[PDB]
Design a protein around this ligand. Structure first.
Ligand SMILES: CCC(=O)Nc1c(C(N)=O)oc2ccccc12
Ligand SMILES: CCC(=O)Nc1c(C(N)=O)oc2ccccc12
Lengths: 179, 245
């Protein structure tokens, strides 16, 4: 099994930490959801190829521009996350996160991931966003942002229900293996 | 880590570590506060374990088995003795607060009600000045340590055999040399997240809410100072490249 490195980036409210926790346990915690994620090395077999995929979170580094880039060396794939319940988190993708990741991780594939997809049809979420003249991110808005930023692809998932989580990390593994 | 502490923090949460008959005696808000304090101490125990892998398994093994050129082991593991002293001392204070809070007759049932004062002490005065000096140095030497490691692994057979030997056990799966370096760099930015969540569940005693608010501000002051004090060192970078920053 060859070793590859994955780093997840995005705003503090994008759900990145929960996504890594749920994938690494194959479970949404029933008793306690951890505040932080240290690291993990997942054994993944995708399309017949075995990989050890090291996983890293950037949570807590968003306000520290000299500490944060120390997470990027030798990254093989980036997950760039936004939450579907937060159009503000999607607005910070093209001109804050994208130029940083392209600078420190040249030629590394980026997969744009819409998190918390279970909230797209949640009445409480729709009522709260409507007060700021907002609505949950539509799938075409996510795809068009991915296309604009030069992403390898666009994917959606829900850490709460686990739907789409395995598929995101299997595709990240495939992207990490490409020349 | 030693077995007594590993067993005391084996459970996924404080609510699963204490006896169920003791858990039933507390209100939900206390359980929520204790679960986050337990994650701060459990993750601190693992961080000190990361530093012991760096000092004992890697650094001391390279000195006792390999013939590396002088200055190379310090280049791979900058500041590791100072980082170990800072965090083993902090861990000792957290574990003594837990041990004093145990019920007589129990080695597992406790509640920590006064964490804020311990965090203010850790993140102020001479201990905060040492943390700032040490992390400003370590984080500025992080790129150089990774590059030195990659060069030795690709070119020195005895070095490659040593690394493959000591990292083979399953318990080292997450703790190769480069992984340990980034776990240490990332530790300091986990503290605000943990303290803010403990503070959210610490409103019942106003003196505790005030002390955790003071501690959160001290930790963010330390992180801002470390971040402003970092400039990556590079082997072979010329003075002209430096003064043209
Ligand atoms: C000081 C060297 C530098 O240019 N750093 C950059 C950072 C950063 N966080 O230091 O983020 C960037 C985003 C795009 C282009 C450059 C940078
Ligand atoms: C609906 C179009 C949009 O909002 N943004 C797009 C931009 C841009 N620079 O605004 O570039 C794209 C490339 C492909 C698909 C989308 C876009």
């Amino acid at each position: 099994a060859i070793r590859k490195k994955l780093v997840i980036v995005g705003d503090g409210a994008c759900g990145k930490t929960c996504l890594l926790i749920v994938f690494s346990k194959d479970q949404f915690p029933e008793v306690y959801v951890p505040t932080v994620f240290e690291n993990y090395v997942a054994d993944i077999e995708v399309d017949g190829k075995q990989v050890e995929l090291a996983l890293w979170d950037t949570a807590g580094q968003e306000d520290y521009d000299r500490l944060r880039p120390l997470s990027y060396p030798d990254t093989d794939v980036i997950l760039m996350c936004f939450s579907i319940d937060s159009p503000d988190s999607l607005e910070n993708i093209p001109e804050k996160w994208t130029p940083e990741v392209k600078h420190f991780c040249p030629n590394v594939p980026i997969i744009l991931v819409g998190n918390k997809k279970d909230l797209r049809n949640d009445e409480h979420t729709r009522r709260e966003l409507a007060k700021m003249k907002q609505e949950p991110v539509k799938p075409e808005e996510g795809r068009d942002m991915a296309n604009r930023i030069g992403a390898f692809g666009y994917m959606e998932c829900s850490a709460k229900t686990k739907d789409g989580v395995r598929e995101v990390f299997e595709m990240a593994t495939r992207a990490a293996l490409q020349a | 880590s030693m077995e007594m502490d590993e067993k005391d923090f084996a459970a996924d949460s404080w609510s699963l570590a204490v006896d169920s008959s003791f858990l039933q005696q507390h209100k939900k808000e206390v359980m929520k506060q204790q679960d986050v304090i337990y994650e701060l101490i459990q993750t601190e125990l693992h961080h000190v374990r990361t530093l012991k892998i760096m000092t004992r398994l890697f650094r001391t093994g390279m000195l006792e088995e390999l013939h590396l050129e002088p200055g190379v082991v310090q280049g791979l593991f900058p500041c590791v003795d100072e980082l170990s002293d800072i965090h083993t001392r902090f861990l000792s204070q957290l574990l003594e607060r837990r041990r004093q809070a145990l019920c007589p007759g129990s080695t597992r049932n406790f509640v920590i009600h006064r964490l804020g004062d311990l965090l203010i002490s850790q993140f102020s005065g001479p201990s905060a000045e040492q943390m700032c000096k040490t992390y400003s140095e370590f984080c500025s030497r992080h790129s150089k340590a990774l590059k030195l490691y990659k060069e030795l692994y690709a070119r020195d057979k005895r070095f490659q055999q040593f690394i493959r030997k000591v990292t083979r056990p399953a318990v080292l799966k997450r703790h190769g040399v480069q992984e340990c370096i980034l776990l240490v760099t990332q530790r300091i930015t986990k503290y605000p997240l943990l303290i803010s969540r403990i503070l959210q569940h610490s409103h019942g005693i106003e003196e505790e809410r005030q002390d955790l608010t003071t501690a959160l501000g001290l930790v963010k002051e330390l992180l801002s100072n470390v971040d402003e004090g970092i400039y990556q060192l590079e082997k072979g970078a010329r003075l002209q490249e430096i003064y043209n920053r």
